[PDB]
Structures are given as structure tokens and as C-alpha cells.
Design a protein around this ligand. Structure first.
Ligand SMILES: OC[C@@H]1O[C@@H](O[C@@H]2[C@@H](O)[C@H](O[C@@H]3CO[C@@H](O)[C@H](O)[C@H]3O)OC[C@H]2O)[C@H](O)[C@H]1O
Ligand SMILES: OC[C@@H]1O[C@@H](O[C@@H]2[C@@H](O)[C@H](O[C@@H]3CO[C@@H](O)[C@H](O)[C@H]3O)OC[C@H]2O)[C@H](O)[C@H]1O
Ligand SMILES: O[C@@H]1[C@@H](O)[C@H](O[C@@H]2CO[C@@H](O)[C@H](O)[C@H]2O)OC[C@H]1O
Ligand SMILES: O[C@@H]1[C@@H](O)[C@H](O[C@@H]2CO[C@@H](O)[C@H](O)[C@H]2O)OC[C@H]1O
Ligand SMILES: O[C@@H]1[C@@H](O)[C@H](O[C@@H]2CO[C@@H](O)[C@H](O)[C@H]2O)OC[C@H]1O
Ligand SMILES: O[C@@H]1[C@@H](O)[C@H](O[C@@H]2CO[C@@H](O)[C@H](O)[C@H]2O)OC[C@H]1O
Ligand code: XYS
Ligand code: XYP
Ligand code: XYP
Lengths: 436, 436
């Protein structure tokens, strides 16, 4: 369809997934969102080295199958995460070196992939093998010490274990094209493809924050890797602050690249995130869709037709032909907004911020005083509350994040002075808005 | 001692208090702040009816005394809260009505005031006796049902129990003069003064939010009651969003009325607030001062003798005479800012929001990716993180809310291109900024 992320992505042959935590599958609020929005699943921890092989030789797939089963039963493919990694290695592997580790690594791969043979769409065969030292070289780990050729061996092994699975190299901070880490990974994959090493994909974790910000050149990075002859996938996406524009930009970068299989966000609600302090996901802890959720859905669905009032613009009601107006250009907090003949004026110029606010006068925010039908919509000092955040639906409707209700011209009024309130979305013309 | 709220309030002959929860007194972070900043204390719950008279005729002051003991031990006066109220009534009282409830009410006042006789500066004798239906009438409670005279009886009883205390009538939604509830209370107080009913004060809770926002006519409300011959006090102040301007405005309103005894904010840190979801106080959960704190302090100190950069403006370092500049007018997230020759360019126009952000381009925020010295100050999409909020100190320095560090011109550099960083605050000219 086009009302959920997974369905929207499928329209272009792609998937939109998440990271599932087994301990939450018992939470109905959690599973209600997950089963509905995503068609791809990655076990957040259940399929890692320490979890699938607690003791060398003895494999445990209980927790993993739990996630795997839920996924397939609910219509989702699975990304295996992960086979060869320097982190989250069980204690016994952390003490292995030389040719014995190399052997342990190979066994582990055969074991996990054997168990899930033919059931995994994508396997993160090797994860984070490059350093952040700025040199573009291999990270210094027990695995790297077994020989520079360990990555290649891991991939050749994997291909044997399960030729049906797409084999990916996964890593973070390899999104910005100008980074040495990015280039080192690029050179490696190019080489692998030239020498014939069995690698089918590169996973871009895409953990963006002010420390390592998203950069428009991310698309260039994806296109370059795609040109090598391998698929690309956004594997663990989360953006600090969950900016609508950035989430939409990453989404469009994937859509702009034919080889971009899909996008996986690292968690369901912000409260489930490994970095909840950055409220980096698409759903609030209370389960409500954030502004970024609708920006992603719209991008996946192809979006609108023409460019929006990028910073500054009027919001005109479809049924009335009138604009959202702040009475007498008042700046008083608590002043309820109204409908009025459109004209150039600041009290009619609204800016949609990446945070999902509809700002007027620069520091005033469209604000909902409550969450039920009839709630008054007014201006109030901006502070970031969810009752000041809105989702801009592609159907012309504007929905409050906190209330999940639509901007509504009271009683379907069209005359000047008609007040604005929150009300159950009805697709009515007094709940649809366009551009002047 | 204009360095703390209490000390600064004292220079205008006023106090600045908070609400203390005894269960948090064992928290050093909480007490360090509470002891330093306030010189007035109100027990958030420990002196209420249910807490002081658990069973009819059986008084318990353990919780109350823990708060009181801490208050006087740290040089603070105490506001007793509260003696007669329709809410938080112990079960045995909720079951009463008529003459039996009337006497219980009187018995409670006598027992509680007797224990604290001569130790309480102000007592909220009656709390929330008026309705919100918008009629300005009395609230329909078991207390009101005993007779319309119950409030008068409560005050006469209180004066007799401890004539050394100021007797206050406390309520909410009585700050906006145009509201019926406000006028209803005004008429009652006026009635009491005329007939000689003992009443020395009116407490305006001041719980401001988008449901009932602050209105500048609050100053007239305070003036109106003051004219009746009673002192006035802002008793449970908290503002949804903690707007710097709203906090400064409420502070100035009180300072504009000679009879306004002082201001009490309902809580220390946002996490201690009964409405933490509204982040309505002056300190963060980590104990750090918020943008609103500095605005209240500056307000208490009389503020700047000249209007700040209202609606955009340049920020010029004193030790360099150069302006805060975004390299090549770039709008790319992650771009570290610099010092550069001041000129009418948008990449040099910064706007300080009520949330404490230093915005550029409209939706880009001065950002710090880290909390330690040497951390680069850059621009990033605005999302409300504390690493995107700043305090404008009277000494001319700009401090990061999350880091507690000052914007610093690297190596005291002065030439163009000099980068900005976060560093331990100094009185240096490379950390001083003039509002031009
Ligand atoms: O709270 C009581 C009254 O209810 C609200 O006012 C209502 C208003 O909410 C209602 O809105 C209509 C509802 O149907 C929708 O299809 C339509 O789009 C929407 O405009 O219209 C009647 C009006 O009286 C206020 O809370 C108060 O008036
Ligand atoms: O969440 C449990 C505890 O609840 C907070 O305490 C609140 C207290 O702050 C509240 O005070 C009322 C607020 O409304 C005013 O009109 C009234 O005058 C004032 O007394 O009363 C309820 C009580 O539960 C604790 O901080 C939080 O830990
Ligand atoms: O585990 C990984 C983290 O170690 C990694 O940390 C990043 C390092 O570079 C900085 O610029 C980033 O801000 C910081 O997040 O992030 C990815 C995560 O998987
Ligand atoms: O719950 C946490 C997981 O969410 C976390 O996941 C890792 C984050 O960093 C990425 O680089 C890894 O690929 C990803 O598996 O691991 C730690 C766990 O506690
Ligand atoms: O219990 C009391 C609440 O019922 C009261 O609610 C207020 C109603 O009017 C609105 O305008 C206010 O925003 C809202 O807080 O608040 C005080 C509380 O003690
Ligand atoms: O790396 C060095 C910085 O750490 C250094 O920081 C200075 C510390 O003292 C403060 O008084 C200065 O303002 C601050 O710049 O600056 C030089 C840089 O090379
Ligand atoms: O724009 C104005 C609107 O805000 C009010 O009503 C009069 C209009 O002219
Ligand atoms: O110019 C007029 C404007 O001032 C008013 O607010 O709305 C109608 C316009 O024609
Ligand atoms: O950012 C600077 C810009 O403002 C100035 O005009 O030219 C030099 C740039 O570095």
C-alpha cells in the first residue's frame, strides 16, 4: 500500500526494517508498531557471536530463532547480524589468537549460517574491520592479527556455508565520502570484486549525530559502491534529534540508488533505542509517529509534486481558500489561530522546522492545548513539546504528533475569522491544506 | 550577593524559594542546589492534610519536620502548605460533610498551626476554593457544602492559632485578570478586608502552560490585589517549556509590585517536578542551570541597561572585536564556527530563542559535540539537545548548558579564521562577547 513504511518501500522493490529486541516481543505496544511498519528484521543482539556460541563448539540459537520466527511469521525477511566482529565476542574467543582464532572464526561462520542456511536474506559477515584513526587502515584486533586476509576468508567461508545469502561488509562512519575510513573500505571492496572475493553488499550503519553528521555526499558514497557491482543497504539508521529533513534525505539517497536494497532503523521507539538520549528514531516512547515518520513515508511514496515553502510560507485551507492566520498579528501566547484571506504578512508566514514545528514570527509555535477533539490550536513560545510538533501528510492534512489529530476549521467554516482546532482526521476539505 | 537567586532577590527586599521533597534530601545534587539558590522553602507534600492528620485527632509531623528542620538549618524561612483544601484529604476526612466536617476542618488548622506556632512566615490557610467552570464561583467540595462561610472561619481560626504568621489564600488560574476565577477571589478578599476577616496575603500559584499561558496583564492582577491591603506572592511557579522571556517577565511583574513578597518555583530540577514532562523549572535533571535560570537571575539583578539583539543580531568578541562567523556561509552540519570581521551577512546573524538556542539561517543551531575542553563549537540541525542550549551571563560570557563551559576563541586567537571551542570559563576577553 502506502500507509506504512514497509509497504511504501515495497512500492519501489525495497524494504524498510528495524532492529528487534527479543525481550520486547512480549510487549503489545511494541509489537503492534513493529509488525505493522516493517518488512525487514535484524536481531539487535540475539544473533551475534557471544549469543550464538557461548562456548566454542556449543551453539545456542534459542533467542535468535525467537526473533527469526517472529519475523517470518509476521511477513519480514531477516538480516543476519553478525558473524565476524571484534566486539561482543564471547570471553573464550577474546583470548584466541593466531591460526586458532582464524579457525574459530571459520567454524562460527559455518555453524550460524548452517543453522539459518537459506533463511537469511542478508548476512553482515564482517562488521567494523576498519579504524577511526584517520589513516583508512584496518582496526587493530585479534581477528586482524590472524592475517590481513581474514575478511576475505570470512566471506569465502560464508559463500560456501550458504550461497543463497547476500554477503555484506558492515561498518559505521563510512557514509561521508571524504573520510579515509570510507575510502579504505571502498578500496577493499573494489579489490575483492576484482580478485573475485564473494561479497555482494556493503552495509552502512548510518549512525548520524553532531559528532559524525549526515552529509549530502552520502548518496555519492552509495553510488560509488553501487558502481563497483555490489548492493548497498542502510543497516542501523538513527539520527540525533530525528530531523525530518535528514531522515527524508537518507531515504531519498537510497531511492536515488538502484542498488540500494532498503533501509533499517536501529529500533522501534525512542525508548527502545541504544541512544534514547538522542531520541533518534521514528516513534516516540508513547508509540506516536514523529514528524520524521511522515517525512520518511512521504519520501518512500514519492512525495508531492512541486517543492514546498522551504522555510517561510503560507498555509492555505483547501475548502476555504483562506490562509492560516494569527489574529491581528498578535504575538500573545494563547492566541488561537484563524482562517483569513491570504496576503503577504508575517502573521501568515509559517516555517516548518526539521523538528516538526510550524513557526511564526521566528520563535512562536503552532501549539495544541490538549489532545482531544475540539482542542484549540494557538501560538505559544517554542519549547519542543510534542503538542508543538506536526506531521505534514501527503494528502494535505496536518497532524499533531502528540494528539494524532488533524488541523480542522471549526464546523467546516470558510469565512474570515473561522477558528482552528484539533479533530479526528476525516479527509474533509476543512482539514486539507496546500500552498498559495 | 547577586550570584544566586535567593541573594539576588534579597537585593529588592524579596525572597526566592522552592518546594522541597523530604525524600530527595539525601540526594547531594538536589541539596547542593536547593541550599545554594533558595532562601524560602515550601513542603511539596509533607504539611498537607493527609500527611499531618492521618487519623482524626491523631497528628503526625515527622515528614513536615524533616523539611522544616532542613530549611532552618540552611537559613531558609518556611511557607506552610496547606491547611484547608478539597484535595489530598485523608480518607476519614473525605467521608465527612456538614457540621462534623466543619469542626474537623477547624480541629486540623488548630493542631497543625499549634505545632508550628511562631515558626512559619506564611501559611496557605485555604487552597483552591474557587471553581474553573469560568463562573468565578466557589468550587463544589465537601468543604464548600458545610456553608459558604467556611473560608472565613478557616482564616479566623488561623489568626487565633498563630497571630505571628501571614495568612494566605492560595489558588491557580487566578493570574490572568480577565478570568472570572481571578475576579471571584478578588471579590472575596475585598469582602474579607471590609468585614475585618483576617487575611494578609494572596498566593498566585502561577502554573503556566499552553492551557493557561502567562499574560502580561498579570502585573495588573498583582497590583489590584496589592491595593486591597494584602501582600501577594508567586507561590508555585513553573512554566511549560521554561521560556526565558516568560520567566523573566513573571520575575519583573513581581518586582514591579512593592507588595509582592517573593517568588517560589515548584521544584528544584525538572526531574523533581510534578510535571517533568513539561520541563518547567530552572534546573536540568543533571543539576545544570537552564537558559531560564540566567534570565531570572538577570531579571532579579535589574537586567541590562540596553535591549538585547531582539530578532537576530551579531555576537562580537571583546578580545578580538570580530564576530561569530559560520565559515563561507556554509549551512553544512558539522561546520565549526569562527571569528571573522563583522559584516551584514546572515552567516553572522544569531538569534537567541526562549529555549536558549543560538540559531543561524533560521533552523541551524550553535552545537557542541562533546562536553570537554577543546570540544569544537559548530552548527547542527536544531533538535533541542542541551548541547544546543546556552546561557548569556551578565559578565558577557556564553556558557553551554550541557557542558557548563564557555565559548572560547582558541589560543586566545584574534585574527580572522580563529576557531571557537568549549573551555573552562575564564574572565578572558576571548570568552567575553558584546551584544551588538
Ligand atoms: O467541546 C464542545 C464543543 O465541541 C467543539 O466545537 C465543535 C467542533 O469541534 C466541531 O467540529 C467539527 C466536527 O466534525 C468534523 O467532521 C468537522 O470537520 C469539525 O469541524 O463542530 C461543531 C463545534 O461546536 C469545542 O470543543 C466546542 O465548541
Ligand atoms: O509523582 C509523584 C510525586 O508527585 C509530586 O508531588 C505532587 C505535588 O507537587 C502537587 O502539588 C500541588 C500542585 O497543584 C497545586 O495547585 C497545589 O497547590 C500543589 O500542592 O500535589 C500532588 C503531589 O503528588 C512529587 O514531586 C512527585 O515525586
Ligand atoms: O559502536 C559504534 C560507535 O563506536 C561509533 O562512534 C562514533 C565515532 O565517531 C564519532 O564521530 C561519532 O559521533 C560516534 O558516534 O558510532 C557507531 C557505533 O556503531
Ligand atoms: O543493545 C545494544 C545494541 O543496540 C548495539 O548494537 C550495535 C551498535 O553499534 C553497531 O556498530 C553494531 O553493528 C550494532 O550491533 O550493540 C550493543 C547492545 O548492547
Ligand atoms: O489539580 C489541579 C488541576 O486540575 C489544574 O488544572 C488546570 C486547569 O486549567 C488549565 O488552564 C491549567 O493549565 C491546568 O493546569 O491545575 C492545578 C492542579 O492542582
Ligand atoms: O589546544 C590548545 C587549547 O587547549 C588552548 O586552549 C586555551 C586554554 O586556556 C584558555 O585561557 C584559552 O582561552 C584557550 O584557548 O588554546 C590553544 C590550543 O592550541
Ligand atoms: O490579517 C488580519 C488577521 O490576522 C485578523 O483579522 C484582520 C486581518 O486583516
Ligand atoms: O492588506 C490587507 C491586510 O492588512 C489585512 O490583514 O488582510 C487583508 C489585506 O488585504
Ligand atoms: O565565513 C567568512 C565570510 O563571512 C567572509 O565574508 O569571507 C570569509 C569567510 O571565511
Amino acid at each position: 500500500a502506502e500507509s506504512t513504511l514497509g509497504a511504501a518501500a515495497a512500492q519501489s522493490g525495497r524494504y524498510f526494517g528495524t532492529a528487534i529486541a527479543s525481550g520486547k516481543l512480549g510487549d503489545s505496544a511494541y509489537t503492534t508498531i513493529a509488525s505493522r511498519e516493517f518488512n525487514m528484521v535484524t536481531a539487535e543482539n540475539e544473533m551475534k557471536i557471544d549469543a550464538t556460541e557461548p562456548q566454542r563448539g556449543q551453539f545456542n540459537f534459542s533467542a535468535g530463532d525467537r526473533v527469526y520466527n517472529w519475523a517470518v511469521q509476521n511477513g519480514k525477511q531477516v538480516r543476519g547480524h553478525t558473524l565476524a566482529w571484534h566486539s561482543q565476542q564471547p570471553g573464550w574467543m577474546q583470548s584466541l589468537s593466531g591460526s586458532t582464532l582464524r579457525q574459530a572464526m571459520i567454524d562460527h561462520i559455518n555453524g550460524v549460517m548452517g543453522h539459518y542456511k537459506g533463511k537469511i536474506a542478508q548476512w553482515d559477515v564482517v562488521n567494523e574491520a576498519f579504524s577511526d584513526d584517520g589513516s583508512g587502515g584496518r582496526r587493530d584486533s585479534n581477528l586482524q592479527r590472524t592475517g590481513n586476509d581474514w575478511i576475505e576468508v570470512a566471506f569465502r567461508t560464508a559463500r560456501a556455508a550458504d550461497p543463497a545469502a547476500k554477503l555484506c561488509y558492515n561498518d559505521y562512519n563510512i557514509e561521508n565520502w571524504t573520510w579515509a575510513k570510507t575510502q579504505g573500505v571502498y578500496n577493499m571492496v573494489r579489490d575483492f570484486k576484482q580478485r573475485g572475493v564473494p561479497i555482494d553488499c556493503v552495509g552502512f550503519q548510518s549512525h548520524f549525530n553532531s559528532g559524525s553528521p549526515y552529509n549530502s555526499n552520502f548518496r555519492t558514497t552509495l553510488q560509488n559502491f553501487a558502481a563497483l557491482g555490489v548492493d548497498v543497504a542502510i543497516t542501523e539508521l538513527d539520527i540525533q534529534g530525528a530531523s525530518s529533513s535528514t531522515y527524508a534525505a537518507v531515504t531519498n539517497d537510497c531511492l536515488a540508488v538502484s542498488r540500494c536494497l532498503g533501509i533499517t532503523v536501529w529500533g522501534v521507539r525512542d525508548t527502545d533505542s541504544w541512544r534514547s538520549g538522542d531520541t533518534p528514531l521514528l516513534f516516540n516512547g508513547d508509540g506516536s509517529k514523529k514528524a520524521a515518520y511522515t517525512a520518511v513515508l512521504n519520501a518512500l511514496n514519492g512525495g508531492s509534486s512541486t517543492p514546498p515553502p522551504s522555510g517561510g510560507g503560507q498555509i492555505k485551507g483547501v475548502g476555504s481558500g483562506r490562509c492560516l492566520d494569527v489574529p491581528n498579528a498578535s504575538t500573545t501566547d494563547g492566541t488561537q489561530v484563524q482562517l483569513y484571506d491570504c496576503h503577504s504578512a508575517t502573521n501568515q508566514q509559517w516555517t516548518y522546522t526539521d523538528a516538526g514545528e510550524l513557526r511564526v514570527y521566528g520563535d512562536k509555535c503552532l501549539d495544541a492545548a490538549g489532545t482531544g477533539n475540539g482542542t484549540k490550536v494557538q501560538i505559544y513560545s517554542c519549547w519542543g513539546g510534542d503538542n508543538q510538533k506536526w506531521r505534514l501528510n501527503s494528502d494535505g492534512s496536518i497532524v499533531g504528533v502528540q494528539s494524532g489529530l488533524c488541523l480542522d476549521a471549526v464546523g467546516g467554516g470558510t469565512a474570515n475569522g473561522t477558528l482552528i482546532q484539533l479533530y479526528s482526521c476525516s479527509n474533509g476539505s476543512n482539514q486539507r491544506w496546500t500552498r498559495t
